[PDB]
Structure 1
Amino acid sequence: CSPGIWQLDCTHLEGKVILVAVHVASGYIEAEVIPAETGQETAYFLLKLAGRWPVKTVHTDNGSNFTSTTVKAACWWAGIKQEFGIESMNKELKKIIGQVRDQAEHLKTAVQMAVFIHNKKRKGGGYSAGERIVDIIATDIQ
């Protein structure tokens, strides 16, 4: 799968909104709890994501997520295109969030604990998602 492809969705938990990005090739995730499910929050999240990784295309399971002018501006500026030509991790990450939830006060804190647990887990049968993304991208540079 192309190293430049990401998937972005929002899930809902405890009346809050979790924006989840998945690097499709590796299974690596990054997430944030956002104060509203809005184009502006999506646009801002995409700018951060694009500054870190070489983001070429983004897919989502809710196409209307990407109609706002604010999202279109962020994909224009960062040189991102929509991927139409294509988990849920939102289940497995939700599973981890449930497992750690009582260990933190704020949902956002549990989310980041779950991201960390997910990305560091050896998928032995055996590198972790965090190891795979770095390998996939580094290899693609060369």
Structure 2
Amino acid sequence: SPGIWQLDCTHLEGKVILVAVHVASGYIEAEVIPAETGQETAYFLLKLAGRWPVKTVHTDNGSNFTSTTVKAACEWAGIKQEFGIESMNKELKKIIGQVRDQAEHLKTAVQMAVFIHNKKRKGGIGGYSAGERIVDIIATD
């Protein structure tokens, strides 16, 4: 299971942020999209699956199950879409608050937040970042 992810959205300044979490690591990827349309979700799944091993994507609701291009991205890349599973979305938003006045565009602040989340140590000291854990779980596999 180095290939299990959770996909959810969150909202900030009235724009949509897609969030993929690697469950076993807490590594995250995220992007501001211009609406919820299946167009962009599909594109971000394909991007994510070109980068990392993506085998199963868990979602919490039915929106991803009613989109033709997500179905086609899933199929082209060999991703199982699968129903049933947060505050990862809440801690993301704290860091977006700590950095928001360091960049003009919200989407720059989302990427600064992802950077910090991925590279920091739990507690601030010792052990691995999310970034190290995802590589260590895939390497160890």
TM-score between both structures, scaled by the size of structure 2 = 0.93
Q: Which moved more, 1:80-89 or 1:112-121?
A: 80-89
Contact 2:21 2:29 in 1 (8 A): yes
| Rounded Cα–Cα distance in structure 1 between residues aligned with 2:84 and 2:7 | 15
Give per-residue Cα distances to partners, 1:52-110, cap 9 Å, x unaligned.
11100001223323320110000000001023363421111011111111111110010
Q: Which moved more, 1:23-32 or 1:62-71?
A: 62-71
How many matched pairs?
139
Q: Which runs of 4+ in 1 moved over 3 A?
A: 84-87
RMSD, matched Cα: 1.4
Contact 1:120 1:128 in 2 (8 A): yes
Contact 2:58 2:85 in 1 (8 A): yes
TM-score between both structures, scaled by the size of structure 1 = 0.92
Q: Kindly, what percent of the aligned residue pairs are identical?
A: 99
Instruction: State the Cα distance separating 1:3 from its structure 2 match.
Output: 1.3
| Rounded Cα–Cα distance in structure 2 between residues aligned with 1:86 and 1:55 | 16
Contact 1:39 1:66 in 2 (8 A): no
| Rounded Cα–Cα distance in structure 1 between residues aligned with 2:109 and 2:85 | 30
Contact 1:9 1:62 in 2 (8 A): no
**Alignment partner of 1:90: what SS?**
helix
| Rounded Cα–Cα distance in structure 1 between residues aligned with 2:123 and 2:31 | 27
Q: CA distance change for structure 1 residues 86 and 15 in 2, over 3 Å: closer, same or farther?
A: closer
Give per-residue Cα distances to partners, 1:32-62, cap 9 Å, x unaligned.
1111111011001100011011100001223
**Alignment partner of 1:51: what SS?**
helix
Unaligned runs of 5+ in 1: none
